[PDB]
Write a protein that binds this ligand. Structure first.
Ligand SMILES: CCCCCCCCCCCCCCCCCC(=O)OC[C@H](CO[C@@H]1O[C@H](CO[C@H]2O[C@H](CO)[C@H](O)[C@H](O)[C@H]2O)[C@H](O)[C@H](O)[C@H]1O)OC(=O)CCCCCCCCCCCCCCCCC
Ligand code: CLA
Ligand code: CLA
Ligand code: CLA
Ligand code: CLA
Ligand code: CLA
Ligand SMILES: CCCCCCCCCCCCCCCC(=O)OC[C@H](COP(=O)(O)OC[C@@H](O)CO)OC(=O)CCCCCCCCCCCCCCC
Ligand SMILES: CC1=C(/C=C/C(C)=C/C=C/C(C)=C/C=C/C=C(C)/C=C/C=C(C)/C=C/C2=C(C)CCCC2(C)C)C(C)(C)CCC1
Ligand SMILES: CC1=C(/C=C/C(C)=C/C=C/C(C)=C/C=C/C=C(C)/C=C/C=C(C)/C=C/C2=C(C)CCCC2(C)C)C(C)(C)CCC1
Ligand SMILES: CC1=C(/C=C/C(C)=C/C=C/C(C)=C/C=C/C=C(C)/C=C/C=C(C)/C=C/C2=C(C)CCCC2(C)C)C(C)(C)CCC1
Ligand SMILES: CC1=C(/C=C/C(C)=C\C=C/C(C)=C/C=C/C=C(C)/C=C/C=C(C)/C=C/C2=C(C)CCCC2(C)C)C(C)(C)CCC1
Ligand code: OEX
Ligand SMILES: [Cl-]
Ligand SMILES: [Fe+3]
Lengths: 30, 28, 37, 25, 449, 32, 27, 61, 337, 344, 34
């Protein structure tokens, strides 16, 4: 059941991406 | 160094070009 | 082949289709002659 | 194949087409 | 203006200097047409000059002569090129005409007036004049219709066209009864482009071809008249960008699409592109190999309808996913093939096993051998065969040249379409030269988060 | 003239390259 | 002997371009 | 002005390379086989070098 | 002073900068490049690989090369005055001395060029990031052209300086090492493709967020401390398109330094691995499963088969010194083909 | 009356919809091209994930020998893939509703066709979307061209090549190992390495990475001291500032002394144009190469081109690479071929 | 299977109609310089 680990890692990456997009700290103009 | 470099590249280039043309006419 | 008459015009025809390319190249020549390119 | 497909396609298309026609008016 | 200072464009983008100069632009177009007709003539005379009587066209690297042969000039029954003189005639005509168009081009480009709106009013135009543009469009559309009717006339009355499906092998035939039924023609139009369907590339009889050209002729003429005598509706006026570059981009998209379509015609169709002239298709060649070894092994005493391959599928004969009896092996992918040398053996449920056992003709075997040995595979330096093949056969099928070249062209033409459409939008709105430092849109927008 | 020099030189280069391309069809390396 | 004819014709066309340009460059 | 010495040396070098090939001196210099020297009357196989420290005597044969 | 005068002369502002680094760089660079031309034009590989290798023999630019030394030479440095050629230039070329010549002079040439980057950087007064970035390519050359053959039997299996020859090295490493399956190589591919991506996207973005600093359609002429493009507009655009955008120019430029360079370094790790035949060739789990279960198939196993084919057939021609004889009955192949 | 018809249509419902669709205030821009893109990419993504994890083996070569591609069927990340549709289907449209059951669909490789078509559509729409947002924000519109290069590549390996070869089974597998397989077979049957357009592609990516590293190193080298020691120099730049953050003259000078004076760029606009142009053209050409080789105009064939006086073949490196090509050719799809020539 | 076809056809026709009629709604006017 290495499939569990692979799925876990993939879900991890996708979650990281999701939070990188919708939970980024907003860029602020000088 | 300008002369040395420019000629360093250009002289053999012409030599080789002649050679290779000559090769274009070598038959089996 | 070509009709026997125009047989004598074989080599010239061999160069005929290469002419449009020359025109392209000519453009650059023209430009270089002017001062641009 | 069946008439149902054409019916639905033409239905949705006509609906959005009318929406657009109102907009154009 | 012919400088960066006077126009704003550099010597490269040099050609953009002609956008608002009607005269020189017309000169450019005419001269270019001159180049096209030049190439047509010169290359045709080249192909006639290099042609050898007792060899197939596709072995000699011909792409123009197969078109003329398809139209029915100098062809004997079977696809034998006997008379090579009409080709010479067309080549000469095109060449001389190229002299005329060339003269006109150089004149309007260098000698004549830059602006045709001053001295003239019929040949002058503003890009923003919708009526004039639709008028020109209408005229040229009518011209295209006339051309379609030229093909129709040529095929109905003047000798006819080469029919590879002709009852008795490929032969020139006058199309007596063309197809005018809208159900059929437009059945082509509204059909899938996928396997077994083929959209408009799947046309397999000259009746439907010529009838289709009747329909397209009528359509182009009626549309030409329509655009000449009308003005664009409100919605079209609101939806489109009205400028020269925009029109250029539209024609570019169109020509990209057409390029792709032509590549597909050259690659799959063998009716408008007879295999006698253009060579076999990939499908046709693969099927030809399967057929060939089916015949060979059947002659060696094998019951091919019962011959089990390594996989468990038929070695020579199997079934298509919809039940039809087809040739086995990889060529199972090519079971949609229709070829005049194979259809004699075709039945209602696919290949007729009885006819396969009994009625296979020598000429069919010759066709299969020839085609499987002239498959459209070859290197860039024209080494015939698969990539691992050795240097002996000098051959690359005309189908490969045509299809690849026109994919190249269609592709880059699409790129040009994106480029010019984008620049058309940006130039219309007014920011094609950069962002206004005093009117930067983003600075007037609420931040994203 | 600079442009005439560039043109002549370019023609020369293209001629030599053309000779090489011809050489791919003749003599050694031509499969003949 | 056909090759020489071909190369002569080629030379003439190729030269034809630049000659027109040079000629007009004088005027 | 500087085209003279170049008109006397550039063609000279060009012809010198040409002669370097046409006289066949290149073959003798770089040990490159002539189109008729790949296989002799004695050897019909590829003449690979097998001895590292005796490559001279091996190449002589 | 003497040394000070030397330094003054060497660091003069010429059309081509020299420097101390120039003392090392220019000779070796010249000799490497020249050896490549000399070899690809005149020298053959008949006595090393049994191959024609030069223009003189009929090779074109694609098939010509300076091939690796004979396998029998081992890891010999193959000096011209070495105990193998013994001064004889002809026998030297026939052995494959030009390969070691090109390789060593090329190596010291790379050292000299990197030192040149450092030197010019220090003289001008810049940060030496160009040299570091260049440590990348160096790692590639050292690992592939030096370490890999040094780990193997001889220089013979090192890449030959030529197009089709390099292609051979490629397919060789695929068939024998399953190099595509190696994660380090995958990181390399990530580095290169990512680098090209960054180059393209940065170029396009800057070109399409330009400020109107002129009236001409030729925006090139209209170019100072002011930014020539709108960073804010770019940020907005890529944030709404891709979800994430750059905000810091310095971080951006460092990033498109970092990605490709890292790629190169990683793939180098991989290549060292292959120098010792320490491959990422197989997945034991799938090999065992496939051994016990004849219905189990993945693209991995298919590629394993492909490797086996490559190895047989080419094995006979690519390694002539081995005298491999494979009867046509033992060559692995499928039905019909 | 000029080019653009500058006019509005008075807070209509359809106009409100068009406004929201084309809104530049949305966190993610959803243009009309997005009206196409979002559903396509979502369907494609869902089917891809579900299949990559749990899809049963697929009879790719139509020879009734199903290949396993999913994780729950013995694959890992590297070997797992979405197996291309059956060669028995070829270029036939095979939607779910044309199969008798989902099981059949899974067996014949329907997922691949679905995912490929939807993905290509959605990615084309992605390109159009890049243009669209560029237009809405008053930008120059040529980012989508740059992106047109990768789209062309994807279209080449997922659509055009199957068209030229007559089957989606020849399309590139959606997976790592499958990709490698695609590459190897492609080399065997087109000799792509000896194709000048692929060489152009390699020039595009190698050169792209080179110029990326070069530009990066140059700008990073000439950063102006705005930061303290041991602190991140990135903090020395602020988003939106107008002052340049590096010494362009110093960089140009360095580059000028590295090679020679006239080898360096002075115009940053020219430099970045070049940076955008080189790899995009490279990739364009390689994409074209994949498609034109999709119609069997293969790479340069120099097999046995060199002959000796007696008439015997003298091999070159092209012959060796031909040996490798032969290996791949004879070994690939061992049970698929019944006849001596591989024409499909 | 037919109902699925009907569903998918409905979706495709829907989004295609929105696309076409959407891009017909004076799109060139949708720019910051208007
Ligand atoms: C832009 C990027 C867009 C990316 C893709 C966007 C998403 C598209 C989603 C759907 C795509 C479906 C494509 C199917 C094309 C195809 O299979 O086309 C095949 C068809 C022909 O079909 C064939 O038609 C044949 C007809 O021959 C038959 O009939 C003949 C009559 O003589 C003969 O008898 C012959 O022997 C006999 O078999 C058979 O039916 C075959 O089975 C059948 O496959 O061609 C045709 O319909 C015409 C094809 C038109 C062009 C196809 C698209 C090309 C796009 C290229 C973009 C490049 C630039 C990108 C830049 C970014
Ligand atoms: C086949 C394509 C084509 C065509 C039809 C044209 C046509 C034209 N170009 Mg153009 N151009 C082309 C390719 C083409 N160009 C290319 C490839 C480039 C390189 C980027 C340019 C760069 C360019 C620039 C920079 C400019 C033009 C301009 C022009 C126009 C005026 C020409 C002029 O005054 O020259 C006069 C030329 C001569 C007097 C010498 C040529 C005489 C004849 C043709 C010699 C032919 C020999 C004969 C046929 C047989 C031998 C004309 C309509 C100009 C323009 O629009 O300004 C208003 C302009 O400024 N072009
Ligand atoms: C219907 C065809 C068509 C027409 C009429 C135009 C017309 C125009 N284009 Mg355009 N374009 C087209 C197709 C077309 N394009 C295609 C298919 C593409 C995609 C490749 C482009 C990409 C393009 C760009 C990127 C740009 C233009 C621009 C322009 C404008 C100036 C062009 C110019 O000066 O050329 C100058 C001509 C040259 C410099 C010659 C270049 C030759 C190329 C690079 C090599 C092609 C290889 C060739 C096939 C053979 C190789 C030679 C070999 C034998 C030695 C002008 C309005 C410019 C613009 O927007 O200005 C408003 C601009 O920047 N075009
Ligand atoms: C696309 C085709 C085309 C078009 C639209 C035009 C259009 C025009 N030509 Mg023309 N021309 C063409 C092809 C074309 N030409 C060709 C192929 C040649 C070579 C035989 C000429 C040779 C030609 C000459 C010699 C003259 C025109 C002139 C004219 C203008 C007035 C002619 C008139 O009203 O009758 C008009 C703008 C006249 C003009 O512009 O004078 C100012 C003029 O004197 N044309
Ligand atoms: C009623 C007016 C009228 C007519 C009859 C034409 C006719 C033509 N124009 Mg034209 N044009 C017009 C107004 C008109 N134009 C206006 C107002 C403008 C804006 C200034 C232009 C701008 C323009 C450009 C820029 C170009 C043309 C071109 C052409 C030719 C197309 C050739 C081709 O391949 O088509 C398709 C051909 C066929 C389908 C074959 C049959 C066509 C008919 C039946 C006969 C063709 C014979 C011969 C070509 C000319 C005789 C035509 C005449 C007897 C009607 C054609 C001669 C093109 C060209 O190359 O000109 C030489 C071109 O590049 N035109
Ligand atoms: C020569 C080509 C040509 C060109 C450039 C134009 C150009 C134009 N026409 Mg036109 N037209 C033509 C030929 C042409 N026409 C012909 C031959 C006819 C019939 C005889 C018409 C009949 C016609 C009418 C009746 C009207 C126009 C209108 C217009 C204008 C609006 C265009 C528009 O919104 O299109 C957008 C078009 C569509 C969205 C229609 C979709 C096409 C359907 C779906 C069939 C295609 C399906 C097909 C099977 C698949 C194709 C494959 C492809 C998608 C890859 C524009 C100026 C309009 C206008 O402004 O009034 C003057 C208008 O009311 N035209
Ligand atoms: C409908 C629209 C759909 C859009 C497509 C979805 C796009 C998703 C993009 C996610 C980006 C995540 C960035 C995290 C990291 C992050 O949040 O960085 C944020 C960062 C912001 O940089 P700043 O300029 O603000 O940094 C200033 C200082 O903090 C620097 O130290 O963005 C970048 O550095 C640009 C490079 C991003 C490009 C990264 C591409 C990676 C692709 C994904 C690879 C793995 C995929 C695995 C799949 C199994
Ligand atoms: C605008 C311009 C341009 C362009 C131009 C062009 C493109 C032109 C063209 C032109 C042309 C396009 C021309 C044509 C001509 C043609 C001709 C001149 C023809 C002739 C013919 C002949 C001579 C024939 C003869 C014969 C016969 C009769 C038959 C038999 C055989 C023979 C051969 C004997 C450029 C860019 C450069 C720049 C400047 C400006
Ligand atoms: C001859 C022939 C035939 C026939 C043909 C025909 C009859 C055709 C037709 C065709 C057609 C009839 C076509 C059409 C097309 C159309 C199109 C292609 C369209 C397009 C569109 C567009 C492009 C649009 C766009 C847009 C949008 C969508 C959005 C808004 C804006 C705009 C408007 C821009 C047959 C097959 C029998 C056989 C073969 C030969
Ligand atoms: C080894 C050795 C050495 C050395 C020597 C040397 C250093 C040599 C050199 C050599 C050289 C230094 C050579 C050169 C060559 C060159 C060449 C061979 C060239 C070619 C060219 C071409 C082929 C062209 C191309 C092109 C371009 C550039 C671009 C555009 C296109 C075209 C194609 C035109 C010594 C004695 C010290 C010692 C012993 C050993
Ligand atoms: C029909 C005929 C005829 C006519 C012909 C013709 C029409 C010709 C033309 C020709 C031509 C039309 C030529 C042209 C040429 C051109 C050229 C030759 C150009 C150029 C070249 C080059 C080489 C360039 C280079 C360059 C430059 C300067 C710039 C850029 C850079 C480069 C370096 C690339 C005759 C009378 C014989 C009679 C018979 C038939
Ligand atoms: O399916 Mn995938 O790979 Ca194109 O080639 Mn024929 O088919 Mn199969 O063999 Mn080789
Ligand atoms: Cl088969
Ligand atoms: Fe930058």
């Amino acid at each position: 059941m290495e499939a569990l680990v692979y799925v876990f890692l993939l879900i991890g990456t996708l979650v990281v991406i999701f939070f990188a997009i919708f939970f980024r700290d907003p860029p602020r103009i000088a | 160094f300008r002369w040395l470099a420019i000629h360093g590249l250009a002289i053999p280039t012409v030599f080789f070009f002649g050679a290779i043309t000559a090769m274009q006419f070598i038959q089996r | 082949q070509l009709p026997e008459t125009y047989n004598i015009f074989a080599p010239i025809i061999d160069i005929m289709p290469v002419i449009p390319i020359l025109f392209l190249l000519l453009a650059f020549v023209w430009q270089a002659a002017v001062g641009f390119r | 194949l069946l008439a149902a497909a054409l019916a639905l396609v033409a239905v949705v298309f006509a609906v959005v087409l009318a929406l657009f026609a109102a907009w154009a008016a | 203006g012919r400088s960066i200072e006077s126009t704003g464009f550099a010597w490269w983008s040099g050609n953009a200097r002609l956008i608002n100069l009607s005269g020189k632009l017309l000169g450019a177009h005419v001269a270019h047409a001159g180049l096209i007709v030049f190439w047509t003539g010169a290359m045709t005379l080249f192909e006639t000059s290099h042609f050898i009587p007792e060899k197939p066209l596709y072995e000699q690297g011909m792409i123009l002569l197969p078109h003329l042969a398809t139209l029915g000039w100098g062809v004997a029954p079977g696809g034998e090129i006997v008379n090579t003189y009409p080709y010479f005639a067309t080549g000469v005509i095109h060449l001389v005409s190229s002299a005329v168009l060339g003269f006109g081009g150089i004149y309007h480009s260098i000698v004549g007036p830059d602006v045709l709106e001053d001295s003239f009013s019929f040949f002058g135009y503003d890009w923003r004049d919708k009526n004039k543009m639709t008028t020109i469009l209408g005229i040229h559309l009518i011209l295209l219709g006339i051309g379609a009717f030229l093909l129709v006339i040529k095929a109905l009355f003047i000798g006819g066209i080469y029919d590879t499906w002709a009852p008795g092998g490929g032969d020139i035939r006058f199309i007596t009864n063309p197809t005018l039924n809208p159900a059929i023609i437009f059945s082509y139009l509204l059909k899938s482009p996928f396997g077994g369907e083929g959209w408009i590339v799947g046309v397999n009889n000259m009746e439907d071809v010529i009838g289709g050209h009747i329909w397209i002729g009528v359509t182009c003429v009626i549309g030409g008249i329509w655009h000449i005598l009308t003005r664009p509706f409100s919605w079209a006026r609101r939806a489109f960008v009205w400028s020269g570059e925009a029109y250029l981009s539209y024609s570019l998209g169109a020509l990209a699409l057409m390029g792709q379509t032509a590549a597909e015609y050259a690659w799959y169709n063998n009716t408008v592109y007879p295999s006698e002239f253009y060579g076999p298709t990939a499908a046709e060649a693969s099927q030809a190999q399967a057929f060939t070894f089916l015949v060979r092994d059947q002659r060696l005493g094998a019951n091919i309808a019962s011959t089990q391959g390594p996989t468990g599928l038929g070695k020579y004969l199997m079934r298509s996913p919809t039940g039809e009896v087809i040739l086995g092996g990889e060529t199972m992918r090519f079971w949609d093939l229709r070829a005049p040398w194979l259809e004699p053996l075709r039945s209602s449920n696919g290949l007729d096993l009885n006819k396969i056992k009994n009625d296979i003709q020598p000429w069919q075997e010759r066709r299969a051998a020839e085609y499987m040995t002239h498959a459209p595979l070859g290197s860039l330096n024209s080494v015939g065969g698969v990539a691992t093949e050795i240097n002996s056969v000098n051959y690359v099928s005309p189908r490969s040249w045509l299809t690849t070249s026109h994919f190249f062209l269609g592709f880059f033409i699409f790129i040009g379409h994106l480029w010019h459409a984008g620049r058309a939008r940006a130039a219309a709105a007014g920011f094609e030269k950069g962002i206004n430092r005093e009117n930067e849109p983003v600075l007037s927008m609420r931040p994203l988060d | 003239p600079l442009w005439l020099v560039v043109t002549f030189g370019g023609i020369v280069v293209l001629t030599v390259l053309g000779i090489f391309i011809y050489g791919s069809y003749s003599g050694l390396g031509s499969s003949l | 002997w056909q090759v020489i004819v071909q190369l002569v014709f080629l030379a003439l066309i190729i030269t034809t371009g630049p000659v027109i340009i040079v000629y007009l460059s004088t005027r | 002005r500087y085209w003279v010495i170049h008109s006397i040396t550039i063609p000279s070098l060009f012809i010198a390379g040409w002669l370097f090939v046409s006289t066949g001196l290149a073959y003798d210099v770089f040990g490159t086989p002539r189109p008729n020297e790949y296989f002799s009357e004695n050897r019909q196989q590829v003449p690979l070098i097998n001895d590292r420290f005796n490559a001279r005597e091996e190449l002589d044969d | 002073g003497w040394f000070d005068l030397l330094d003054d002369w060497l660091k003069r502002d010429r059309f081509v900068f020299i420097g101390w680094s120039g003392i090392l760089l220019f000779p070796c660079a010249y000799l490497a490049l020249g050896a490549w031309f000399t070899g690809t034009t005149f020298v053959s590989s008949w006595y090393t690989h049994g191959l024609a290798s030069s223009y003189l023999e009929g090779c074109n630019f694609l098939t010509a090369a300076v091939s690796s030394p004979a396998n029998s030479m081992g890891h010999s440095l193959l000096f011209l005055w070495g105990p193998e050629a013994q001064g004889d230039f002809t026998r030297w070329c026939q052995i494959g001395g030009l390969w070691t010549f090109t390789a060593l002079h090329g190596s010291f040439g790379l050292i000299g060029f990197c030192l040149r980057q450092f030197e010019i950087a220090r003289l001008v007064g810049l940060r030496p990031y160009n040299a570091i970035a260049f440590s990348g390519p160096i790692a590639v050359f050292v690992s592939v052209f030096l370490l890999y053959p040094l780990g193997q039997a001889s220089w013979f299996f090192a890449p030959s300086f030529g197009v089709a020859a390099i292609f051979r090295f490629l397919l060789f490493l695929q068939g024998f090492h399953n190099w595509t399956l190696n994660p380090f190589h995958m990181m390399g591919v990530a580095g290169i493709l990512g680098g090209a991506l960054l180059c393209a996207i940065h170029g396009a973005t800057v070109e399409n967020t330009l400020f109107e600093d002129g009236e001409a359609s030729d925006t090139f002429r209209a170019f100072q401390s002011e930014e020539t493009y709108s960073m804010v507009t770019a940020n907005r655009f890529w944030s709404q398109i891709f979800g994430v955008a750059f905000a810091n120019k310095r971080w951006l430029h460092f990033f498109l330094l970092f990605v490709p360079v890292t790629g190169l370094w990683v793939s180098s790790i991989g290549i060292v691995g292959l120098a010792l035949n320490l491959r990422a060739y197989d997945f034991v789990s799938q090999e065992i499963r496939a051994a016990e279960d004849p219905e189990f198939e993945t693209f991995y196993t298919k590629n394993i088969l492909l490797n086996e084919g490559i190895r047989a057939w080419m094995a006979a021609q690519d390694q002539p010194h081995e005298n491999f004889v494979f009867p046509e009955e033992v060559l692995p192949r499928g039905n019909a083909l | 009356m000029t080019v653009t018809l500058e006019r509005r249509e008075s807070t209509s419902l359809w106009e409100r919809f068009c406004s929201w669709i084309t809104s530049t205030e949305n966190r993610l821009y959803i243009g009309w091209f997005g009206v196409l893109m979002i559903p396509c990419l979502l369907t494609a993504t869902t089917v891809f994930i579900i299949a990559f994890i749990a899809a049963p083996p697929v009879d790719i070569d139509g020879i009734r020998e199903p290949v396993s591609g999913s994780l729950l069927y013995g694959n890992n990340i590297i070997t797992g893939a979405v197996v291309p549709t059956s060669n028995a289907i070829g270029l036939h449209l095979y939607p779910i509703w044309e199969a008798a059951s989902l099981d059949e669909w899974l067996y014949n490789g329907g997922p691949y066709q679905l995912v490929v078509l939807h993905f290509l559509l959605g990615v084309a729409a992605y390109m159009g979307r890049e243009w669209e947002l560029s237009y809405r924000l008053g930008m120059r519109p040529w980012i989508c061209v740059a992106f047109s290069a990768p789209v062309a590549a994807a279209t080449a390996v997922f659509l055009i090549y199957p068209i030229g070869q007559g089957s989606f089974s020849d399309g590139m597998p959606l997976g790592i190992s499958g990709t490698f397989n695609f590459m190897l077979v492609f080399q065997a049957e087109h000799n792509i390495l000896m194709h000048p357009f692929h060489m152009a592609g390699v020039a595009g990516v190698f050169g792209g990475a080179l110029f990326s590293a070069m530009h990066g190193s140059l700008v990073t080298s000439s950063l102006i001291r705005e930061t303290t020691e041991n602190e991140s120099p990135n903090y020395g730049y602020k988003l939106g500032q107008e002052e340049e953050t590096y010494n362009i003259v110093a960089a140009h000078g360095y580059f000028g002394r590295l090679i020679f004076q006239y080898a360096s760029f002075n115009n940053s606009r020219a430099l970045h144009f070049f940076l955008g142009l080189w790899p995009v053209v490279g990739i364009w050409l390689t994409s074209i190469g994949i498609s034109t080789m999709a119609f069997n105009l293969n790479g340069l064939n120099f097999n046995q081109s060199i002959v000796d006086s007696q008439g015997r073949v003298i091999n070159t490196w092209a012959d060796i690479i031909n040996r490798a090509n032969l290996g791949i050719e004879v070994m690939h799809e061992r049970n698929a071929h019944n006849f001596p020539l591989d024409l499909a | 299977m037919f109902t699925l076809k009907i569903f998918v056809y409905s979706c495709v026709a829907f989004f295609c109609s929105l696309f076409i009629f959407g891009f017909l709604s004076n799109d060139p006017s949708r720019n910051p310089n208007r």
